[PDB]
Amino acid sequence: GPEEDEVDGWLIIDLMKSTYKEEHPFEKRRSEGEKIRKKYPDRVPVIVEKAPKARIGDLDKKKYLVPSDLTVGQFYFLIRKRIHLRAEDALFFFVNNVIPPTSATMGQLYQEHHEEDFFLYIAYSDESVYG
């Protein structure tokens, strides 16, 4: 459920819409996120999860470390291929419940949308409204 974490004198409220967040306590996630960012300042750590209601393939692995210059379009290609999605079937990414432009880079998305644990969370679905 909704979580509250204190960082730098702020009480951070997180609606916790992520299986990964539910299974990994905030302190552990932020500690790992800090470590990955320090070790690889040029890479973007992404947690990729299927929207619950989406009737398409699930991912076997959620954790991707991608170059900052990888485009959203290239990441679509990778995810689509990994879940064996036919070309006739739609796939949408959501970051903070908004579909990012295919032309955006993963570094841009990280800078605009990374969470208080230093991970970027992307959900995906077969439909353009998240659910």
PDB file of C-alpha atoms in Angstrom:
ATOM      1  CA  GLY A   1       0.000   0.000   0.000  1.00  0.00           C
ATOM      2  CA  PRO A   2       0.949   3.685   0.118  1.00  0.00           C
ATOM      3  CA  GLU A   3       4.406   4.061   1.638  1.00  0.00           C
ATOM      4  CA  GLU A   4       6.086   6.950   3.439  1.00  0.00           C
ATOM      5  CA  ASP A   5       9.857   7.340   3.529  1.00  0.00           C
ATOM      6  CA  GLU A   6      11.915  10.149   4.992  1.00  0.00           C
ATOM      7  CA  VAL A   7      14.781  11.464   2.859  1.00  0.00           C
ATOM      8  CA  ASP A   8      16.725  14.658   3.610  1.00  0.00           C
ATOM      9  CA  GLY A   9      14.034  16.080   5.877  1.00  0.00           C
ATOM     10  CA  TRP A  10      11.163  15.395   3.446  1.00  0.00           C
ATOM     11  CA  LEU A  11       8.401  12.846   3.935  1.00  0.00           C
ATOM     12  CA  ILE A  12       8.135  11.137   0.531  1.00  0.00           C
ATOM     13  CA  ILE A  13       4.743   9.643  -0.300  1.00  0.00           C
ATOM     14  CA  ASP A  14       4.742   6.770  -2.791  1.00  0.00           C
ATOM     15  CA  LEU A  15       1.509   5.282  -4.066  1.00  0.00           C
ATOM     16  CA  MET A  16       3.471   2.020  -4.503  1.00  0.00           C
ATOM     17  CA  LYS A  17       2.007   0.978  -7.864  1.00  0.00           C
ATOM     18  CA  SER A  18       4.665  -1.670  -8.495  1.00  0.00           C
ATOM     19  CA  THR A  19       5.185  -5.299  -7.556  1.00  0.00           C
ATOM     20  CA  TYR A  20       8.924  -4.618  -7.418  1.00  0.00           C
ATOM     21  CA  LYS A  21       8.432  -1.821  -4.891  1.00  0.00           C
ATOM     22  CA  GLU A  22       6.201  -4.076  -2.786  1.00  0.00           C
ATOM     23  CA  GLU A  23       8.809  -6.869  -2.737  1.00  0.00           C
ATOM     24  CA  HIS A  24      11.858  -4.684  -1.969  1.00  0.00           C
ATOM     25  CA  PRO A  25      11.889  -2.287   1.012  1.00  0.00           C
ATOM     26  CA  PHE A  26      12.571   1.347   0.162  1.00  0.00           C
ATOM     27  CA  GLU A  27      15.860   1.453   2.077  1.00  0.00           C
ATOM     28  CA  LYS A  28      17.208  -1.484   0.048  1.00  0.00           C
ATOM     29  CA  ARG A  29      16.015  -0.062  -3.291  1.00  0.00           C
ATOM     30  CA  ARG A  30      17.535   3.371  -2.728  1.00  0.00           C
ATOM     31  CA  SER A  31      20.790   1.825  -1.510  1.00  0.00           C
ATOM     32  CA  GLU A  32      21.006  -0.263  -4.680  1.00  0.00           C
ATOM     33  CA  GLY A  33      19.960   2.666  -6.870  1.00  0.00           C
ATOM     34  CA  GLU A  34      22.607   4.941  -5.378  1.00  0.00           C
ATOM     35  CA  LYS A  35      25.231   2.243  -5.914  1.00  0.00           C
ATOM     36  CA  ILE A  36      24.330   1.611  -9.562  1.00  0.00           C
ATOM     37  CA  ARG A  37      24.284   5.331 -10.374  1.00  0.00           C
ATOM     38  CA  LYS A  38      27.689   5.919  -8.751  1.00  0.00           C
ATOM     39  CA  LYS A  39      29.239   2.917 -10.504  1.00  0.00           C
ATOM     40  CA  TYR A  40      27.712   3.795 -13.918  1.00  0.00           C
ATOM     41  CA  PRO A  41      26.851   7.505 -14.164  1.00  0.00           C
ATOM     42  CA  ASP A  42      26.274   7.075 -17.906  1.00  0.00           C
ATOM     43  CA  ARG A  43      23.666   4.291 -17.592  1.00  0.00           C
ATOM     44  CA  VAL A  44      19.991   4.410 -16.642  1.00  0.00           C
ATOM     45  CA  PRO A  45      18.651   1.729 -14.256  1.00  0.00           C
ATOM     46  CA  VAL A  46      15.101   0.754 -15.312  1.00  0.00           C
ATOM     47  CA  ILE A  47      12.485  -1.441 -13.639  1.00  0.00           C
ATOM     48  CA  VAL A  48      10.065  -2.713 -16.312  1.00  0.00           C
ATOM     49  CA  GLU A  49       6.747  -4.229 -15.296  1.00  0.00           C
ATOM     50  CA  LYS A  50       3.572  -5.315 -17.066  1.00  0.00           C
ATOM     51  CA  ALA A  51       0.382  -3.443 -16.308  1.00  0.00           C
ATOM     52  CA  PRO A  52      -1.856  -5.820 -14.310  1.00  0.00           C
ATOM     53  CA  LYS A  53      -4.845  -5.858 -16.697  1.00  0.00           C
ATOM     54  CA  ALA A  54      -2.731  -6.308 -19.851  1.00  0.00           C
ATOM     55  CA  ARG A  55      -3.342  -9.640 -21.604  1.00  0.00           C
ATOM     56  CA  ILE A  56       0.103  -9.841 -23.255  1.00  0.00           C
ATOM     57  CA  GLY A  57       3.296 -11.649 -22.342  1.00  0.00           C
ATOM     58  CA  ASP A  58       5.018 -10.954 -19.044  1.00  0.00           C
ATOM     59  CA  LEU A  59       8.761 -10.272 -18.723  1.00  0.00           C
ATOM     60  CA  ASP A  60      11.007 -12.813 -17.120  1.00  0.00           C
ATOM     61  CA  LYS A  61      13.472 -10.149 -15.930  1.00  0.00           C
ATOM     62  CA  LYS A  62      12.545  -6.650 -14.762  1.00  0.00           C
ATOM     63  CA  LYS A  63      15.912  -4.951 -14.277  1.00  0.00           C
ATOM     64  CA  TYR A  64      17.587  -3.265 -17.253  1.00  0.00           C
ATOM     65  CA  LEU A  65      20.715  -1.092 -17.297  1.00  0.00           C
ATOM     66  CA  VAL A  66      20.576   0.909 -20.508  1.00  0.00           C
ATOM     67  CA  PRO A  67      22.700   3.605 -22.180  1.00  0.00           C
ATOM     68  CA  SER A  68      21.406   7.124 -21.713  1.00  0.00           C
ATOM     69  CA  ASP A  69      21.268   7.579 -25.497  1.00  0.00           C
ATOM     70  CA  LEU A  70      19.034   4.537 -26.079  1.00  0.00           C
ATOM     71  CA  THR A  71      15.765   5.830 -27.450  1.00  0.00           C
ATOM     72  CA  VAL A  72      12.344   4.846 -26.176  1.00  0.00           C
ATOM     73  CA  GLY A  73      11.789   3.439 -29.665  1.00  0.00           C
ATOM     74  CA  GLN A  74      14.766   1.106 -29.354  1.00  0.00           C
ATOM     75  CA  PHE A  75      13.606  -0.005 -25.900  1.00  0.00           C
ATOM     76  CA  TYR A  76      10.178  -0.837 -27.324  1.00  0.00           C
ATOM     77  CA  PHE A  77      11.885  -3.026 -29.911  1.00  0.00           C
ATOM     78  CA  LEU A  78      13.845  -4.851 -27.210  1.00  0.00           C
ATOM     79  CA  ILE A  79      10.864  -5.424 -24.914  1.00  0.00           C
ATOM     80  CA  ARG A  80       8.509  -6.394 -27.747  1.00  0.00           C
ATOM     81  CA  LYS A  81      11.074  -8.927 -28.943  1.00  0.00           C
ATOM     82  CA  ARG A  82      11.651 -10.415 -25.492  1.00  0.00           C
ATOM     83  CA  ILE A  83       7.930 -11.065 -24.865  1.00  0.00           C
ATOM     84  CA  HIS A  84       7.456 -12.425 -28.437  1.00  0.00           C
ATOM     85  CA  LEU A  85       4.823  -9.814 -29.272  1.00  0.00           C
ATOM     86  CA  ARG A  86       3.662 -10.049 -32.911  1.00  0.00           C
ATOM     87  CA  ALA A  87       3.951  -6.885 -34.968  1.00  0.00           C
ATOM     88  CA  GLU A  88       0.161  -6.597 -35.248  1.00  0.00           C
ATOM     89  CA  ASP A  89      -0.097  -6.264 -31.448  1.00  0.00           C
ATOM     90  CA  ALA A  90       0.224  -2.916 -29.678  1.00  0.00           C
ATOM     91  CA  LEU A  91       2.683  -2.094 -26.906  1.00  0.00           C
ATOM     92  CA  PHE A  92       2.715   1.073 -24.776  1.00  0.00           C
ATOM     93  CA  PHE A  93       5.156   2.327 -22.160  1.00  0.00           C
ATOM     94  CA  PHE A  94       4.009   4.436 -19.210  1.00  0.00           C
ATOM     95  CA  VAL A  95       6.242   6.591 -17.040  1.00  0.00           C
ATOM     96  CA  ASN A  96       4.369   8.206 -14.177  1.00  0.00           C
ATOM     97  CA  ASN A  97       1.203   7.168 -16.059  1.00  0.00           C
ATOM     98  CA  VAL A  98       2.116   9.067 -19.254  1.00  0.00           C
ATOM     99  CA  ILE A  99       3.151   7.531 -22.573  1.00  0.00           C
ATOM    100  CA  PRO A 100       6.587   8.948 -23.456  1.00  0.00           C
ATOM    101  CA  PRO A 101       7.475  10.052 -26.987  1.00  0.00           C
ATOM    102  CA  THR A 102       9.080   7.304 -29.034  1.00  0.00           C
ATOM    103  CA  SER A 103      11.827   9.833 -29.854  1.00  0.00           C
ATOM    104  CA  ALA A 104      12.778  10.444 -26.202  1.00  0.00           C
ATOM    105  CA  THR A 105      15.997   8.919 -24.868  1.00  0.00           C
ATOM    106  CA  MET A 106      16.230   6.857 -21.690  1.00  0.00           C
ATOM    107  CA  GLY A 107      18.552   9.436 -20.134  1.00  0.00           C
ATOM    108  CA  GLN A 108      15.946  12.138 -20.724  1.00  0.00           C
ATOM    109  CA  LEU A 109      13.250   9.946 -19.162  1.00  0.00           C
ATOM    110  CA  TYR A 110      15.484   9.225 -16.175  1.00  0.00           C
ATOM    111  CA  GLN A 111      16.136  12.932 -15.600  1.00  0.00           C
ATOM    112  CA  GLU A 112      12.445  13.804 -15.820  1.00  0.00           C
ATOM    113  CA  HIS A 113      10.896  10.824 -14.046  1.00  0.00           C
ATOM    114  CA  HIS A 114      13.313   8.797 -11.898  1.00  0.00           C
ATOM    115  CA  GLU A 115      11.938   7.894  -8.487  1.00  0.00           C
ATOM    116  CA  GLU A 116      13.236   8.621  -5.003  1.00  0.00           C
ATOM    117  CA  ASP A 117      15.126   5.284  -5.068  1.00  0.00           C
ATOM    118  CA  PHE A 118      17.111   6.389  -8.170  1.00  0.00           C
ATOM    119  CA  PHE A 119      15.366   3.811 -10.395  1.00  0.00           C
ATOM    120  CA  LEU A 120      13.277   4.651 -13.470  1.00  0.00           C
ATOM    121  CA  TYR A 121       9.988   2.726 -13.451  1.00  0.00           C
ATOM    122  CA  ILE A 122       8.347   1.828 -16.757  1.00  0.00           C
ATOM    123  CA  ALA A 123       5.061  -0.046 -17.007  1.00  0.00           C
ATOM    124  CA  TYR A 124       3.885  -1.568 -20.264  1.00  0.00           C
ATOM    125  CA  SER A 125       0.513  -2.589 -21.623  1.00  0.00           C
ATOM    126  CA  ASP A 126      -1.368  -3.592 -24.766  1.00  0.00           C
ATOM    127  CA  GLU A 127      -3.634  -0.532 -24.405  1.00  0.00           C
ATOM    128  CA  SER A 128      -2.975   3.201 -24.232  1.00  0.00           C
ATOM    129  CA  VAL A 129      -4.718   3.740 -20.872  1.00  0.00           C
ATOM    130  CA  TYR A 130      -2.898   2.266 -17.897  1.00  0.00           C
ATOM    131  CA  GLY A 131      -4.630  -0.547 -16.027  1.00  0.00           C
TER     132      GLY A 131
END
